[PDB]
Write a structure and sequence with these properties.
alpha/beta, 4-stranded mixed beta sheet, 3-stranded mixed beta sheet, binds 4-(1,4-oxazonan-4-yl)-7H-pyrrolo[2,3-d]pyrimidine, Papain-like protease nsp3, viral protein, hydrolase
Length: 167
């Protein structure tokens, strides 16, 4: 039993809910919240800027120190950093930004990072500014992640479309 409430069960391991991932993290304080990161961990907008804003910029301060030591992530890669006031840990995962020419095949590699964590609260990857179509992202998620993932999807029109179109 875990603390996640109001989710629709899609599969044995994948759950979905119309809720801001920021709002949800504050309420649940999960072990792991996933950030929709870029390779520079520059949290300017969307999931990352909203998560970072909710940490009063402490996520960005920690992230800048990480990059100064380690250099950029890979597209499809991840790192584990603090969850600050939102979660124990934040798994920063870089999905394929299609508007920068980043191979559509890399979304599966991105979701494979989730398998290193038994339970996660997560954004659909490569939605919004990444230039990808969310129905595809949910399919790859379901076909790739084997651990227990709670997808906070903050677009009802999109939530309802994802549910209604789910095979
Ligand atoms: C969950 N998913 C989020 N997505 C879903 C909406 C599609 C993306 C639009 O760019 C944010 C993307 C957000 C954003 C702020 N909070 C969130 N929580």
């Amino acid at each position: 039993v875990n603390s996640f409430s109001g989710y629709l069960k899609l599969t044995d391991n994948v759950y979905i809910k119309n809720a801001d991932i920021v709002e949800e993290a504050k309420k649940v304080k999960p072990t792991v919240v996933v950030n929709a990161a870029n390779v520079y961990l520059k949290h300017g907008g969307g999931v990352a800027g909203a998560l970072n804003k909710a940490t009063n910029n402490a996520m960005q301060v920690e992230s800048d120190d990480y990059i100064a030591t380690n250099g950029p992530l890979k597209v499809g890669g991840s790192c584990v950093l603090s969850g600050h006031n939102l979660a124990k840990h934040c798994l920063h995962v870089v999905g394929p930004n299609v508007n920068k020419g980043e191979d559509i095949q890399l979304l599966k590699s991105a979701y494979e990072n989730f398998n290193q964590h038994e339970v996660l609260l997560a954004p659909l990857l490569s939605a919004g500014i990444f230039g990808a179509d969310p129905i595809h992202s949910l399919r790859v998620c379901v076909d790739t992640v084997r651990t227990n993932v709670y997808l906070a999807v903050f677009d009802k029109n999109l939530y309802d479309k994802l549910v209604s179109s789910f095979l």
